[PDB]
Write a protein that binds this ligand. Structure first.
Ligand code: SF4
Ligand SMILES: [Mg+2]
Ligand SMILES: [Mg+2]
Ligand SMILES: [Mg+2]
Ligand SMILES: [Mg+2]
Ligand SMILES: [Mg+2]
Ligand SMILES: [Mg+2]
Ligand SMILES: [Mg+2]
Ligand SMILES: [Mg+2]
Ligand SMILES: [Mg+2]
Ligand SMILES: [Mg+2]
Ligand SMILES: [Mg+2]
Ligand SMILES: [Mg+2]
Ligand SMILES: [Mg+2]
Ligand SMILES: [Mg+2]
Ligand SMILES: [Mg+2]
Ligand SMILES: [Mg+2]
Ligand SMILES: [Mg+2]
Ligand SMILES: [Mg+2]
Ligand SMILES: [Mg+2]
Ligand SMILES: [Mg+2]
Ligand SMILES: [Mg+2]
Ligand SMILES: [Mg+2]
Ligand SMILES: [Mg+2]
Ligand SMILES: [Mg+2]
Ligand SMILES: [Mg+2]
Ligand SMILES: [Mg+2]
Ligand SMILES: [Mg+2]
Ligand SMILES: [Mg+2]
Ligand SMILES: [Mg+2]
Ligand SMILES: [Mg+2]
Ligand SMILES: [Mg+2]
Ligand SMILES: [Mg+2]
Ligand SMILES: [Mg+2]
Ligand SMILES: [Mg+2]
Ligand SMILES: [Mg+2]
Ligand SMILES: [Mg+2]
Ligand SMILES: [Mg+2]
Ligand SMILES: [Mg+2]
Ligand SMILES: [Mg+2]
Ligand SMILES: [Mg+2]
Ligand SMILES: [Mg+2]
Ligand SMILES: [Mg+2]
Ligand SMILES: [Mg+2]
Ligand SMILES: [Mg+2]
Ligand SMILES: [Mg+2]
Ligand SMILES: [Mg+2]
Ligand SMILES: [Mg+2]
Ligand SMILES: [Mg+2]
Ligand SMILES: [Mg+2]
Ligand SMILES: [Mg+2]
Ligand SMILES: [Mg+2]
Ligand SMILES: [Mg+2]
Ligand SMILES: [Mg+2]
Ligand SMILES: [Mg+2]
Ligand SMILES: [Mg+2]
Ligand SMILES: [Mg+2]
Ligand SMILES: [Mg+2]
Ligand SMILES: [Mg+2]
Ligand SMILES: [Mg+2]
Ligand SMILES: [Mg+2]
Ligand SMILES: [Mg+2]
Ligand SMILES: [Mg+2]
Ligand SMILES: [Mg+2]
Ligand SMILES: [Mg+2]
Ligand SMILES: [Mg+2]
Ligand SMILES: [Mg+2]
Ligand SMILES: [Mg+2]
Ligand SMILES: [Mg+2]
Ligand SMILES: [Mg+2]
Ligand SMILES: [Mg+2]
Ligand SMILES: [Mg+2]
Ligand SMILES: [Mg+2]
Ligand SMILES: [Mg+2]
Ligand SMILES: [Mg+2]
Ligand SMILES: [Mg+2]
Ligand SMILES: [Mg+2]
Ligand SMILES: [Mg+2]
Ligand SMILES: [Mg+2]
Ligand SMILES: [Mg+2]
Ligand SMILES: [Mg+2]
Ligand SMILES: [Mg+2]
Ligand SMILES: [Mg+2]
Ligand SMILES: [Mg+2]
Ligand SMILES: [Mg+2]
Ligand SMILES: [Mg+2]
Ligand SMILES: [Mg+2]
Ligand SMILES: [Mg+2]
Ligand SMILES: [Mg+2]
Ligand SMILES: [Mg+2]
Ligand SMILES: [Mg+2]
Ligand SMILES: [Mg+2]
Ligand SMILES: [Mg+2]
Ligand SMILES: [Mg+2]
Ligand SMILES: [Mg+2]
Ligand SMILES: [Mg+2]
Ligand SMILES: [Mg+2]
Ligand SMILES: [Mg+2]
Ligand SMILES: [Mg+2]
Ligand SMILES: [Mg+2]
Ligand SMILES: [Mg+2]
Ligand SMILES: [Mg+2]
Ligand SMILES: [Mg+2]
Ligand SMILES: [Mg+2]
Ligand SMILES: [Mg+2]
Lengths: 208, 96, 99, 69, 82
RNA sequence: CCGAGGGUAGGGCCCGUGACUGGGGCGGUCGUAACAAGGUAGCUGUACCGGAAGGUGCGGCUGGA
RNA sequence: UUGGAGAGUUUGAUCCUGGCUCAGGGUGAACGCUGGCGGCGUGCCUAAGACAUGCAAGUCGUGCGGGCCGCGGGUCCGUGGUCAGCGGCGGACGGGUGAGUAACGCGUGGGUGACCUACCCGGAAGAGGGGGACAACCCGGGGAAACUCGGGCUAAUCCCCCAUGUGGACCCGCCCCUUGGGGUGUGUCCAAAGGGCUUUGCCCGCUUCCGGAUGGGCCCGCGUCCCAUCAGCUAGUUGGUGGGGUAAUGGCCCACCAAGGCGACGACGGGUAGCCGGUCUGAGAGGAUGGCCGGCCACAGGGGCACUGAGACACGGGCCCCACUCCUCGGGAGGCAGCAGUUAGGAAUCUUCCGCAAUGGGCGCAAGCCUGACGGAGCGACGCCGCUUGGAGGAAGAAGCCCUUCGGGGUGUAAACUCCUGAACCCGGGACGAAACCCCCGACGAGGGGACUGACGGUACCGGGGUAAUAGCGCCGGCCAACUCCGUGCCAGCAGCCGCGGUAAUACGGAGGGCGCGAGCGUUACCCGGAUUCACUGGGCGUAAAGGGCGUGUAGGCGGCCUGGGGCGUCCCAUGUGAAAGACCACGGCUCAACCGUGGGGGAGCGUGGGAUACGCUCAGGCUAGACGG
């Protein structure tokens, strides 16, 4: 299954705060603040000039590690993209983002995708009032991303729902708070989202 | 160590005997009838030819001769009997 | 339809049968270029009327013998002994492709 | 190594009797096995993978050389 | 004789027939003469039967006989109504 | 009559194997043919000779002077 | 216009040529180390070696007669079990395998005026009379078995004759039509079988003939591997006349006449191979492949053969030869390339399972019986797909370990620790797959209504409760993402190519660290790719590999300017074919996906008809710039 190990190190290698830890990421106690060099015995060693493969390799793990996902599943999504109409990179982020477990995080139901994935695998979420635990459920335009209403009386949805009364879910989402629901209205535009990811470097990688 | 297969085999032998039996007589008769046409013996030919003719179609009734078979047999018995008699005619009685 | 084909009589030295050589053309499936190829058909002449030179049409017909499966349809042209040489001079040439 | 135990036989004076089980403290012959050799412990699949006490004793006493002509 | 019967497709525990016309002595799921409409015995979607009743008549006329449960879904959508 | 095949006899192709022998490849002994005009320009087809490289005759080539 | 990346290694250095090598995708895989759950798939590639044992094809008492067991009562009749037997239909389907086959076997498009098709469905006619055989059972030999023999009685939808002739068949003739297609006239020739119930009629049956349907057989064009260090082949050979054979054309077979037939466009011969839909790879063109599934073929230990039949030269039918094996003196027995299983070979390949509940096949009127087809279950990371080993907080940062200029650095928010969730498990409920066949009203029809039936399965899923709960493998000189310390000292070893190891090795071994993948990671084998390195797309030959020593000429390929006819190539439109699964786009079912369902879009390619005429082709006239001549 998923990456599961020490997760700061991901960010320290990648030279970019990926906001994996969620609640802690903004603290001065994150690792990227105190030491933003790569993990392990050799980070404070004056880094060396990176090859093109490297550059696209690092760029790729970057995108991948963000959504916290198996290189298997990642590549297969990606393949779906190329064959699908029009702009590959965009449709990639699209399908990357049209996946459930990450939705739940976009809608702040949970702190991080990790925490989100748990929530989703646990039956604590439902699309359309049908209970759905598979973190790879590609959500399609029109879906009602409920919280399980028998999961409602639960300290942690509350806490996170509570810090979500009037922040802004991106242009494609619609958190009716209080009632625990929300909605998937639009597959993202490229501009719709900024991640520290050159959408193109990744296409150039899988071209080798 | 089983069957009604052997029952089938059992039967076929009984059947075989009969197909073979009728089949013989046809040839025997056709040949005989034909024979007479080479000497003719106009009357006697046809008489046998008749009997040949008949024993033919009769056998086509069952699994012995296909219709198209009996059809061929007569078709050739006939041509042969008429043509021989063409050498010294006198066709009487009837079968042509 | 009964395939009709057109060709020259190259052998009539048979008895109620004539050999009809048939060219066809088509493009090479890999190299585009048009190429000729050919085939000798044993052809039924029940009234022996066809002879050397006689470019004719023959038609797909029911079997008459082993390897006769066409009968001549209609005399189309006459005396093309240039084509007849064009085929003897090739045949003949064979006597020096041996060892 | 895993191994299928097809049939179980008791050997009598005159005939071979098939039997559907063989309890503890008893002897019989199992048909089906493929890799098992003598002095090899055998356990049901979902059980402690214990190895029975082996056996062990005498070293060979006489030695003879063989020449592959 | 020529027949109308259910030619299974789909997958394991997902029956998905395809009531069909084919020579009696084919494999169940082998080369058929004509497809005259499906059938989903599990009832998983609004269309768990659509006999081409235009076609399904033509056959019955010229010979074709049918399963004691071919006709079941042939009657069910009435190829028999007077 | 034909006929599985059996048998007699003589052939063709293939494969394996064989005392011994021929060179070929891979990992000390003799000389110094080639690379500098390489110490006789080199190479060449052929031919005869020579432990060996090679030498020599005749002709050719320059990719030599 | 949804499609195309390159690197390393020849020198002191360079450019070019050129080979080698690597990254990628794929698999019926196998091997190592490791391994938790589940879904769909999938699983003897080898010895088409040999097989123990069970099972895999039967059904009908509504075709007929019988031997035994009964049950209401007067050795009787009745009826239903029951074992055969005669008799029907099936057993030619379905299931297995790829040996043989380089072939009309297959693919694709056609031909049959050269043909067949049980059951099924339409339509027309008929079902009169008389006769007769064999099993069963009774009698009696032989055998230790297989099991057989001879004599004697017996039924029928079994067997034959006569009549009926709607009609069919054949000879001759004639009308049409053109290969044997349809009509007609005379002669001749041919049909049948009964059972059933509620009995002045319905139900299943049988006969001849016509048409349909589906299934076939045979024939033809075109496509289908390697060697020319295989170059010539051929006597049933090629053609003919007559005849046999068949459902039917044919040298299919036979007798005779003729002297032919085939071959560098590759005959003959040798090798290898079942083909296709498809699959994999590829930018494409192309290369490679044909296991699972669907279509055709071929085979049933090795051969040959025919019988019965609508259909077979018949996988679990028959005969005969051969090899092998088993049984206990005349002989008998066997054929898992059906399902499981065994044995052997092998790197390697599963349960002697469950059920006929579903779908489909056989038989019967029906109830029903039979089905190792099939529906499911088990085993296997073999493949793909989903899922878990947790989530939030948690130090200027514990211990141990690695490094160090000795100050510090790293593993590392990682751990401990707080808390939130709650895989497994525990209880409770619990399926869809199954509505027909049949019974009832109607009319045994249309419509209506009622009943029985679930292997998987107490499984999926639902509902309640509910424990922090497996991680491993490859790499870290360059290609190529990832670096230090010790050990070692051309040793031990690494290695795909360069090359690394001779005391300070980022290249061996261990450690800490790191990179990549993660129930997997690697390795070997092989296919396509990079290989534009067989070059059609898309290469080359002065010196790199590569111009024939030079002519003359055969076939072949190619071919100037003008006008015209044809329209073969070529272009265009129509139409048929191009099965299903697949692939592609859309939607939809399983919570998702894999898997799967429904619809859409079709193309090459070939048939058929119409059209165009520039280029090429052919034919017909003219030219003189090429060429030859004076
Ligand atoms: S906390 Fe800082 S270090 Fe840890 S993940 Fe969030 S961003 Fe990276
Ligand atoms: Mg709860
Ligand atoms: Mg790629
Ligand atoms: Mg006699
Ligand atoms: Mg017969
Ligand atoms: Mg008949
Ligand atoms: Mg002839
Ligand atoms: Mg002989
Ligand atoms: Mg012989
Ligand atoms: Mg013999
Ligand atoms: Mg030899
Ligand atoms: Mg020297
Ligand atoms: Mg010199
Ligand atoms: Mg010299
Ligand atoms: Mg020199
Ligand atoms: Mg010399
Ligand atoms: Mg000497
Ligand atoms: Mg000398
Ligand atoms: Mg000289
Ligand atoms: Mg020089
Ligand atoms: Mg590349
Ligand atoms: Mg080198
Ligand atoms: Mg050099
Ligand atoms: Mg060097
Ligand atoms: Mg190179
Ligand atoms: Mg590529
Ligand atoms: Mg393994
Ligand atoms: Mg299951
Ligand atoms: Mg399975
Ligand atoms: Mg096999
Ligand atoms: Mg294979
Ligand atoms: Mg046995
Ligand atoms: Mg009986
Ligand atoms: Mg039969
Ligand atoms: Mg084969
Ligand atoms: Mg051959
Ligand atoms: Mg062919
Ligand atoms: Mg063909
Ligand atoms: Mg029959
Ligand atoms: Mg009687
Ligand atoms: Mg009569
Ligand atoms: Mg002859
Ligand atoms: Mg003839
Ligand atoms: Mg004939
Ligand atoms: Mg012949
Ligand atoms: Mg003939
Ligand atoms: Mg002669
Ligand atoms: Mg040719
Ligand atoms: Mg061979
Ligand atoms: Mg083969
Ligand atoms: Mg290419
Ligand atoms: Mg197949
Ligand atoms: Mg055979
Ligand atoms: Mg055989
Ligand atoms: Mg065998
Ligand atoms: Mg045999
Ligand atoms: Mg059989
Ligand atoms: Mg047989
Ligand atoms: Mg056969
Ligand atoms: Mg068998
Ligand atoms: Mg088996
Ligand atoms: Mg072994
Ligand atoms: Mg096995
Ligand atoms: Mg299996
Ligand atoms: Mg059943
Ligand atoms: Mg049934
Ligand atoms: Mg069974
Ligand atoms: Mg699994
Ligand atoms: Mg997986
Ligand atoms: Mg400090
Ligand atoms: Mg520490
Ligand atoms: Mg410290
Ligand atoms: Mg943590
Ligand atoms: Mg709790
Ligand atoms: Mg049910
Ligand atoms: Mg009634
Ligand atoms: Mg329960
Ligand atoms: Mg629950
Ligand atoms: Mg823990
Ligand atoms: Mg690796
Ligand atoms: Mg790599
Ligand atoms: Mg590097
Ligand atoms: Mg030191
Ligand atoms: Mg040492
Ligand atoms: Mg190593
Ligand atoms: Mg060192
Ligand atoms: Mg050194
Ligand atoms: Mg090292
Ligand atoms: Mg290395
Ligand atoms: Mg290659
Ligand atoms: Mg290529
Ligand atoms: Mg090459
Ligand atoms: Mg080229
Ligand atoms: Mg080149
Ligand atoms: Mg040179
Ligand atoms: Mg020259
Ligand atoms: Mg020469
Ligand atoms: Mg010329
Ligand atoms: Mg011209
Ligand atoms: Mg020309
Ligand atoms: Mg045209
Ligand atoms: Mg298709
Ligand atoms: Mg869906
Ligand atoms: Mg479709
Ligand atoms: Mg002219």
């Amino acid at each position: 299954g998923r990456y599961i190990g020490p997760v700061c190190r991901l960010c320290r290698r990648e030279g970019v705060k990926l906001y994996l830890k969620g609640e802690r990421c903004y603290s001065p106690k994150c690792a990227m603040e105190r030491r933003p060099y790569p993990p392990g015995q050799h980070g404070q060693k004056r880094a060396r000039r990176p090859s093109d493969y490297a550059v696209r390799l690092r760029e790729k793990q970057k995108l991948r590690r963000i959504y916290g996902i198996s290189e298997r599943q990642f590549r297969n999504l990606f393949e779906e993209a190329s064959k699908k109409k029009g702009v590959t990179g965009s449709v990639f982020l699209g399908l990357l983002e049209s996946r459930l477990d990450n939705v739940v995080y976009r809608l702040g139901f949970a702190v991080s995708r990790r925490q989100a994935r748990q929530l989703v695998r646990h039956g604590h979420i439902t699309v359309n009032g049908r209970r759905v635990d598979l973190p790879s459920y590609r959500v399609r335009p029109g879906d009602e991303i409920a919280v399980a209403e028998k999961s409602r009386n639960l300290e942690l949805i509350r806490q996170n729902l509570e810090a979500m009364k009037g922040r802004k879910v991106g242009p494609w989402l619609s958190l009716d708070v209080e009632g625990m629901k929300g909605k998937f209205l639009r597959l993202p535009d490229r501009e719709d989202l900024a991640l520290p990811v050159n959408e193109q470097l990744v296409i150039e990688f899988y071209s080798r | 160590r089983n069957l009604s297969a052997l029952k089938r085999h059992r039967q076929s032998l009984k059947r075989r005997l009969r197909n073979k039996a009728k089949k013989s007589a046809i040839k025997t008769l056709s040949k005989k009838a034909i024979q007479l046409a080479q000497e003719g013996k106009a009357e006697e030919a046809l008489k046998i030819m008749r009997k040949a003719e008949s024993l033919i179609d009769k056998a086509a009734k069952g699994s012995t001769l296909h219709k198209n078979a009996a059809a061929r047999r007569k078709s050739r018995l006939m041509r042969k009997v008429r043509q021989l008699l063409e050498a010294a005619g006198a066709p009487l009685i009837g079968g042509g | 339809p009964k395939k009709v084909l057109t060709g020259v009589v190259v052998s009539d030295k048979m008895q109620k049968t004539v050999t009809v050589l048939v060219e066809r053309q088509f493009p090479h499936p890999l190299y585009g270029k048009v190429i000729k190829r050919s085939k000798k058909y044993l052809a039924h002449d029940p009234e022996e009327k066809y002879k050397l030179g006689d470019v004719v049409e023959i038609i797909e017909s029911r079997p008459i013998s082993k390897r006769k499966r066409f009968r001549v349809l209609r005399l189309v042209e006459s005396g093309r002994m240039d084509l007849v040489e064009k085929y003897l001079i090739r045949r003949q040439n064979y006597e020096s492709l041996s060892k | 190594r895993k191994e299928r135990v097809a049939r179980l036989l008791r050997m009598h004076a005159n005939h071979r009797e098939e039997v559907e089980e063989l309890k503890a403290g008893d002897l019989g012959a199992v048909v089906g096995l493929k890799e098992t050799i003598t002095g090899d412990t055998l356990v049901g699949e979902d059980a402690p993978r214990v190895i029975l006490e082996s056996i062990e004793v005498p070293e060979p006493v006489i030695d003879v050389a063989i020449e592959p002509k | 004789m020529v027949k109308i019967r259910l030619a299974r497709f789909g997958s394991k525990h997902n029956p998905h027939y395809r009531i069909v016309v084919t020579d009696a002595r084919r494999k169940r799921d082998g080369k058929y003469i004509e497809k005259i409409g499906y059938y989903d015995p599990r009832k998983t979607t609004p269309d768990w039967l659509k006999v081409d009743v235009e076609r399904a008549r033509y056959w019955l006329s010229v010979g074709a006989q049918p399963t004691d449960t071919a006709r079941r879904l042939l009657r069910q959508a009435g190829v028999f109504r007077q």
